[PDB]
Amino acid sequence: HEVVKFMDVYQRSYCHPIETLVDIFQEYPDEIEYIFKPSCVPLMRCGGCCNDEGLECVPTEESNITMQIMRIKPHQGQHIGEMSFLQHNKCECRPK
Amino acid sequence: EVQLVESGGGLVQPGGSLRLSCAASGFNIKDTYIGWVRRAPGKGEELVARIYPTNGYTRYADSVKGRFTISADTSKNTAYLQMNSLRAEDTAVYYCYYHYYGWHPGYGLSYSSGQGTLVTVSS
Structure with a gap:
């Protein structure tokens, strides 16, 4: 079995920008009678951890x-x- | 035919200020996010500030929070960016931009931007 090394997981x-699948309607919740297709779009967005309960990736x-929908x-x-x-070009860990 | 007419750029010393303005015609700014992006020497485009003039919701780059202030006068169809306490790193070309809020029908232009104004911060 091929165990992933600590430094690699770490x-x-x-905290960094990662491809994230974002629900369109949550971004633009205004015409509730319309649906979008696709209903979600691929966006670079901050994610991952900060390894300190007092920091958040932002x-x-x-x-x-801009996309065709x-x-x-x-x-x-x-x-x-x-x-x-909006995509996120840069992320960091900052006080909550 | 949309026009964005940009003014207000120039050269200042650190701590100095400029006021950018972007006068739009060919559309109503209340229908849009209108704002600025900037491109500095060897960097990617970054959002600087934006405003939805329908309600005055704004957003700012983390690096300009507390220094820059975007506003809009809907009766002149014009947005403004007050840039205070400028630093060397703010040196860039600043472009006015807009895109239609939410979903924009069809194949026509939904997002656009201007020629750019130069902002230099030296000495």
Whole structure:
């Protein structure tokens, strides 16, 4: 059996930007009668741990990304449009 | 046809200030996030500040919190960025940008940005 080394687990789990699948509607919760397809988008977002219950990983640099998303009124048609989201370029551990 | 008209850049000494403005036409800014990004020598684009003029919700880069302040006058369809207590690292090209809030129908342009204003912080 191939056990992952301590330092490897340790560096890999530490606070940093990681590809994260983000629910669109949670970002933009405003027209409750419409659904999006896909309902979630792939965004670089801070994740991982700080190994101190008093610190949290949080973005310190951000940037826009713009994607094509279908909007759907459920028995009507689906239409193409565009939406823009924030990615996290940089993360760090900061007091809670 | 959208235009973003940018003004307010220039050269200052540390601790100094500038006020950027971005006067939009061809759309209503209340329909958008409007704000600034910046690109410094050998760095990627970074969001500096943004405002949703429909309710005045704002967001800021961590590095400018407490120094910069974004606002909007919807009757002039214009946004402003007050930049206080400037440092050397703020040296960049600052671009006005917007994108339509939420979902924007179809294939037309949903996100755009300006020519840029230069901001230098020296001495």
